[PDB]
Amino acid sequence: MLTIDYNSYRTTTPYGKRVRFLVLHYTALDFAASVKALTTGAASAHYLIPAPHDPSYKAAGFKGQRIFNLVAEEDRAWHAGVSGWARRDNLNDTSIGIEIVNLARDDDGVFTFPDYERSQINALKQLAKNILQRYPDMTPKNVVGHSDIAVGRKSDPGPKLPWKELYEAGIGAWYDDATRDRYREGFERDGLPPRADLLEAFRLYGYALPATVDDAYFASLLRAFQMHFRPENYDGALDVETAAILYALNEKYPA
Amino acid sequence: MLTIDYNSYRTTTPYGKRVRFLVLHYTALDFAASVKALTTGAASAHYLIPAPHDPSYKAAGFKGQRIFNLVAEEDRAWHAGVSGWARRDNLNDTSIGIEIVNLARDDDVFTFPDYERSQINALKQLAKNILQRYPDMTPKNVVGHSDIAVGRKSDPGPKLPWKELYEAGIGAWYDDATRDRYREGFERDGLPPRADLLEAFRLYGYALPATVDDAYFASLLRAFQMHFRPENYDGALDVETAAILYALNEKYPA
Amino acid sequence: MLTIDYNSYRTTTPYGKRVRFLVLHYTALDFAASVKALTTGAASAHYLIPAPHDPSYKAAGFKGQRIFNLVAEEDRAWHAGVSGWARRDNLNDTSIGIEIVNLARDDDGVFTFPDYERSQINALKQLAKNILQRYPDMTPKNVVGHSDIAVGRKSDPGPKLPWKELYEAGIGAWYDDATRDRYREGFERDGLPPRADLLEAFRLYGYALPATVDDAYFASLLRAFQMHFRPENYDGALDVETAAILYALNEKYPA
Amino acid sequence: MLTIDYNSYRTTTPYGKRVRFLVLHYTALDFAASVKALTTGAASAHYLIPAPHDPSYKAAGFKGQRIFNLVAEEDRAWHAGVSGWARRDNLNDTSIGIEIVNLARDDDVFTFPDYERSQINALKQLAKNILQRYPDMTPKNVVGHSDIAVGRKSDPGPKLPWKELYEAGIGAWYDDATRDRYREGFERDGLPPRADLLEAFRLYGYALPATVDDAYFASLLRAFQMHFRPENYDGALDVETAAILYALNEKYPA
């Protein structure tokens, strides 16, 4: 029988990695309910970042902050579900998923999002930096939250996720203030762009938009976008600062 | 300075492999041109199976049949291009690509030369090896490039012995009784309308466009014929083709 | 920060795989005690081949023959312990381990080795063939049993392991009868080689021999070697057929 | 035709990584010569860190600092050669190799040019990345080629800023108080005999031969000095070297 030849020829230029997206999640369960759920349940993730001040995190034997690998990076974890981004879908296929332990909650009708611990965030920066250096096609726009890829079925990582902080650590996409201001200028002078240009702009950035956009959808689109890039207010309303941030991101990060 | 914990917890049930498809191509070029084009060129493939009776090949240092890895399975080779199968698309993300050296020609009309016996044996060994390590790589998921890029591609063509691979436990094929049963029914009931036919092709796995031309429909049939009714792949609708399709769908309801 | 470049240059000739050895084990426990032991215990293996006629194999939910992956091939399973072969040691590092469910037993003072099921053996041939095609440096002599690499602390895969069958499937090292006979001829004419040549021969084949070989060691060396290559009798005694098989293997598979 | 079951059971506690060592080398050649020698030559390495102020480099197409992967971490690069550390040997099996472009020279006497600042930053980033994914790659396990092939190799040499990497959380280094404490003791008690010294080197990790020459002992000291007392690596026994060693052993009793 034949032994495969791995030495005589190797591809150099025309190839890549399978993974190009990095997705952030909150668990909305305490540590113990999270591991169980993400290992033996109906969903998994590549990494689970626990919150050290979690009574069942201590109850399980743990002390300080750590990072847990649940599925190997080369394998498909089930974390994204039905999703889209940058003209791809079924994002489980092409992504690594990070789950963060956080008691975000819950649809009591009302969404309530608690802070993240600091050790968690320092872990997340270390982790994602480790990953990005190893996957050349996960460019800034491709570090996303579950809510960007599943508008608006999901609401993680949430408005407590310090995206700009991550960006300053070289993790993810953020705009330049000068550029944002100029678009704002800007829209306050000749007015907000037609909804057509906006939809186009959102698609352009990465959002997987339906063929026709509901008023309720558009709300959820803005909300998701604001929860990520304009978290001071994410009521889902089209103001000029929102439109400005979008346009600035597109300018900074085009095709 | 945390270290990652790979020991405390390990997902069992809810996870899988990123790869679930296996795509077969022909190179349309000799060995020397293929290895160059798939290693430094515009495209690539996970594996290359050379044709031993090739001066390029012998000249390169080789004699007997072998199997070359060019891209590690875990990486993304550039072989599917714009493509779709089984409700997925961009099949480069989730497939493994096999290139077989074979001098297929598109002048204005296609000449498809036979594959060497040793190539088929190598292919059979390589596919079994892969099929055993990718649980969701079910039989309908071993496809030709022409199955996933309909009308754009004609590889691996009609000389690829699909039935032979099926007998080796590689890829989908129909039961003879089931086909005859369907052809019997269509013969006395008439063929289904295009609309239902198309649905059947979707069902099997083909990535159908929003609307279909006479032209696309032809090339869809031509593609399906090259794989499953190679004795005639003119792209014309006849009862056998439809019967084979319906036969396939019944055996593999996935 | 820098993204690693995986495309500009790729090594072709001067590299290899980390793994080059394939080691066979019996579990000496029923299925249920095996999984538990090899997943949460003090030892693991890359693969676990269950025996389908095992009441707890059925009790766990299983029906027909399958193959279980416990540790990924790229990772280090703990199956070899203190071991040596072909001038390497710490074989856990460079090997893939297959555990076979089999009620081999037990040192009641007496060793008793039951047959393996046939579906198990067909599984093992399929599995090892899959592996060998993917690791170019696991040449025939490098498919070994735990007892070859740990003389004589271990007694698996045991004399019920059909090595010659595996060889005919292209898995592992076996001699040619013509060649064996010639050495036998051979020794019956001018006598068995001095113990020095024999020790040298055994080292040469792959065995990790101590600096000085006890009479009891030499027994265990022969035994292990016979359990693998001359299983009709493995009493640990130096006959001429044993010496002949050794010499033939060395001729067929030299450096 | 079984498929492998990767979902039913997964080992948690009793398993690890095959890699636990990180070895640093210098190329002793410019960029163009290095990439050629490590890709098609007699040796290789997992990663190559180029020196940006190099005509070979700029000529190849590059300008800024970057990091090249040549062999996937999971594979075996050919960089350690005959070697030993921490009771293991053949370190190619269980290590990852990093080559840094640096024009070190052995005429009859060694010239070791400084590393560029950008190279050190890249190295620091690369090592942290690796250290985080290999739990048993403990600080004593980040070694120079000269630590594992004593007397055979002199890389990465005295210009490699080990303390600097230690501060980044990469590799072993001693506590100043602990060293002074040991040097104080040796100064008033006398140095230990060779026999005990050697044991201490073993303890730290060095792979010692059955018997030691004056010659080997010298090159052992020279190796250890290049790493941990670079201000003087003549290979002569003095209290500082011994103190640093004993200081290391106390901090890292692994």
Q: Which of A129, A145, A172 is the last residue in one of the domains?
A: A172
- Does B139 lie in the same domain as B205? no
Distance from CA of B246 to the nearest CA of C (A): 31
Given a contact as 3+ CB pairs under 8 Å, which chains touch D?
A, B, C
Judge: B39–A77 Cβ closer than 8 Å, yes or no: no
Coil, helix or strand for D93? coil
Of C175, C168, C200, C199, the closest CA to residue C251 belongs to C175
In a domain, A9, yes or no: no
Closest residue in chain A to residue D128, using alpha carbons only? A130
- Does D167 lie in the same domain as D199? no
Distance from CA of D131 to the nearest CA of B (A): 7
Judge: C126–B133 Cβ closer than 8 Å, yes or no: no
Coil, helix or strand for C112? strand
Backbone phi and psi for residue C74, each to the nearest 5 degrees, phi listed first: -75, -15
Residue B93: both structure tokens together: 């993300």
B7 vs D contacts (CB less than 8 Å): 12-13, 15-16, 135
Coil, helix or strand for B142? strand
Q: Determine whether the annotation assigns residue D108 to a binding site.
A: no
Coil, helix or strand for D12? coil
- Alpha-carbon distances, residue B86 vs B96, B207, B213, C147, D167 (angstroms): 15, 7, 21, 48, 52
- Provide the angle, in degrees to the nearest 10, between the axes of the packed helices D194-204 and D239-251: 40
| Best residue of A1, A2, A88, A125 to probe chain B, by most B CBs closer than 10 Å | A2
Judge: C134–B129 Cβ closer than 8 Å, yes or no: yes
Q: How many domains in chain B?
A: 2
Give C158-213 as a DSSP string. -TTS-HHHHHHTT-S----HHHHHHHHHTHHHH-PPPHHHHHHHHHHHT----SS-
- Does C247 lie in the same domain as C129? no
Could you give the CA distance from residue A107 to residue D223 in angstroms, rounded to a whole number? 64
Could you give the CA distance from residue C253 to residue D11 in angstroms, rounded to a whole number? 36
Judge: A12–C7 Cβ closer than 8 Å, yes or no: yes
C-alpha distance across the termini of chain D, in Å: 47
Judge: A13–B40 Cβ closer than 8 Å, yes or no: yes
Could you give the CA distance from residue C93 to residue C81 in angstroms, rounded to a whole number? 10
Of A78, C136, A136, the closest CA to residue B76 belongs to A136
Chain Cα centroid distance, residue A187: 28
In a domain, D6, yes or no: no
Given a contact as 3+ CB pairs under 8 Å, which chains touch C?
A, B, D
Chain A residues with CB-CB distance to C under 8 A?
A: 1-13, 15-17, 72, 129, 132-134, 136, 170
- Does B154 lie in the same domain as B190? no
Q: Which of A172, A201, A236 is the last residue in one of the domains?
A: A172
| Best residue of B3, B9, B119 to probe chain A, by most A CBs closer than 10 Å | B9
Q: Which residue matches tokens 């990520």?
A: A228
Residue pair D91/D44 in contact (Cβ under 8 Å)? The answer is no
Q: Determine whether the annotation assigns residue B155 to a binding site.
A: yes
Strands (E), B47-107: 47-49, 67-69, 75-77, 84-85, 88-89, 95-100, 105-106
In a domain, B4, yes or no: no
Could you give the CA distance from residue B104 to residue B159 in angstroms, rounded to a whole number? 10
Resolution (A): 2.3
Coil, helix or strand for B200? helix
- Does A50 lie in the same domain as A31? yes
Strands D95-100 vs D110-111: parallel, antiparallel or unpaired: unpaired
Could you give the CA distance from residue C171 to residue C157 in angstroms, rounded to a whole number? 15
Burial of C237 (0-12, 13-18, 19+ CB in 10 A): exposed
In a domain, C134, yes or no: yes
Residue pair A145/A70 in contact (Cβ under 8 Å)? The answer is no
- Does D243 lie in the same domain as D204? yes
Structural element, H or E, at residue D76: strand D75-77
Q: Which residue matches tokens 């000389």?
A: B159
Q: What single DSSP character describes residue A99?
A: E
Q: What single DSSP character describes residue B45?
A: -
Residue pair A148/A207 in contact (Cβ under 8 Å)? The answer is yes
CATH number for the domain including B59?
A: 3.40.80.10
Residue pair C162/C231 in contact (Cβ under 8 Å)? The answer is no
CATH number for the domain including A221?
A: 1.10.101.10
Closest residue in chain A to residue C17, using alpha carbons only? A6
- Does C70 lie in the same domain as C128? yes
Dihedral angle computed from the Cα positions of residues B126, C67, C96 and D142, in that order, rounded to the nearest 10 degrees: 100
Q: Which residues of C189-201 are buried (b: 16+ CB within 10 A; e: fewer)?
A: eeeebeeeebbeb
- Does D153 lie in the same domain as D30? yes
Overall size of chain C counted in residues: 255
- Alpha-carbon distances, residue B38 vs A243, B66, B120, D235 (angstroms): 44, 17, 20, 52
In sequence order, which residues have a C-beta less than 8 Å from that of residue B51 and are 6 or more positions away? B31, B57, B100, B101, B102, B115, B116, B119
In sequence order, which residues have a C-beta less than 8 Å from that of residue A196 and are 6 or more positions away? none
Chain Cα centroid distance, residue B62: 27
- Does A188 lie in the same domain as A100? no
Strands (E), chain A: 4-5, 15-17, 21-26, 47-49, 67-69, 75-77, 84-85, 88-89, 95-100, 105-106, 111-112, 143-145
Q: What single DSSP character describes residue C29?
A: S
Q: Which of D108, D137, D171 is the last residue in one of the domains?
A: D171
Q: Containing domain of residue D39, as a range? A: 17-171
- Does D67 lie in the same domain as D54? yes
In a domain, A5, yes or no: no
The structure was resolved experimentally with X-ray
In a domain, C136, yes or no: yes
Judge: A6–C132 Cβ closer than 8 Å, yes or no: no
Residue pair C241/C181 in contact (Cβ under 8 Å)? The answer is no
- Does C223 lie in the same domain as C162? no
Judge: D76–C44 Cβ closer than 8 Å, yes or no: no
In a domain, C54, yes or no: yes
Q: What single DSSP character describes residue A233?
A: -
Of B13, B10, B24, B8, the closest CA to residue B146 belongs to B24
Q: Which of B4, B8, B135 sits opposite D12 (nearest CB)?
A: B8
Coil, helix or strand for C37? helix
Could you give the CA distance from residue A184 to residue A126 in angstroms, rounded to a whole number? 34
Q: Is B116 considered catalytic here?
A: no
Q: Which residue matches tokens 């598979």?
A: C253
Closest residue in chain A to residue D126, using alpha carbons only? A133
In a domain, C114, yes or no: yes
Burial of B87 (0-12, 13-18, 19+ CB in 10 A): exposed
C-alpha distance across the termini of chain B, in Å: 47
Give C50-110 as a DSSP string. --SS-HHHHHTT--S--EEE-S-TTEEES-S-S-EETTEE-TTTTEEEEEE----EE-SSS
Q: Which residues of A136-146 are buried (b: 16+ CB within 10 A; e: fewer)?
A: eebbebbbbbb
| Best residue of C1, C13, C18, C79 to probe chain D, by most D CBs closer than 10 Å | C18
CB half-sphere exposure, C207, CA atoms < 13 A? 27
Q: Alpha-carbon Rg of chain A, whole angstroms? A: 20
- Does D53 lie in the same domain as D138? yes
Q: Which of D2, D13, D133 sits opposite B4 (nearest CB)?
A: D133
